[PDB]
């Protein structure tokens, strides 16, 4: 009848962040040993997509989790669908892929107010092609030039010689499909260890 743990999960430190990471270099924050209130996140109510897998989001608040990881990145509006288990797309195949047995949540909200500027922001990149598909939660930030050509590239972008990463270029005048969206993916395991507490 008396509470032990006094630690708030630092969701603010992951959401009120100055600049999110590029989708090819998605940032991950280890969450542990803290209480979290998901009612405040859903009540913020600005998110365009707040969908959870393995557990209904409405009844998420009264469960105890372990190995909670928050992955943050920025993608295109039309690319939101790709952040889901088993989806095939430009991003999911080569940038960030949820596994088929996914257990976490996906949060996505429009960032056209901050992450685009007149003339465009080209600081958010995506990996166009990769030699092999990415494994779940695999993080590959390599910048090795494809040199399918006579001469060796020697680390110079050019012709017969292509660079993997492509700039997004969000302008505030873009279509909603091309507008930038900030995404946070929560990976966790459902824990039922104390029968009374987590039953």
């Amino acid at each position: 009848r008396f509470p032990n743990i006094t630690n708030l999960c630092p969701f603010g430190e992951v959401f009120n962040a100055t600049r999110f990471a590029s989708v090819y270099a998605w940032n991950r924050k280890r969450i542990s040993n803290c209480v979290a209130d998901y009612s405040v996140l859903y009540n913020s109510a600005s998110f365009s997509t707040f969908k959870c897998y393995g557990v209904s989001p409405t009844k998420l608040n009264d469960l105890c989790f372990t190995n909670v990881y928050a992955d943050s990145f920025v993608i295109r509006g039309d690319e939101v669908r790709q952040i889901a288990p088993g989806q095939t797309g430009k991003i999911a195949d080569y940038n960030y892929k949820l596994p088929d047995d996914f257990t976490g949540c996906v949060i996505a909200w429009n960032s056209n107010n901050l992450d685009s500027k007149v003339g465009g922001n080209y600081n958010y990149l995506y990996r166009l092609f990769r030699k092999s598909n990415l494994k779940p939660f695999e993080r590959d930030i390599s910048t090795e030039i494809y040199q399918a050509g006579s001469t060796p590239c020697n680390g110079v972008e050019g012709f017969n010689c292509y660079f993997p990463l492509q700039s997004y270029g969000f302008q505030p005048t873009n279509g909603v499909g091309y507008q930038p969206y900030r995404v946070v993916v929560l990976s966790f395991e459902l824990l039922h260890a104390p029968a009374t507490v987590c039953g």
């Binding site: 999960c9 040993n33 608040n61 009264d62 105890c64 372990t66």
Partner: peptide
């Protein structure tokens, strides 16, 4: 309860 597991708010009340 156990330090090192992320409790939800209502489950932290039950704690």
């Amino acid at each position: 309860x156990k330090a090192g597991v992320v409790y939800g708010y209502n489950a932290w009340i039950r704690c």
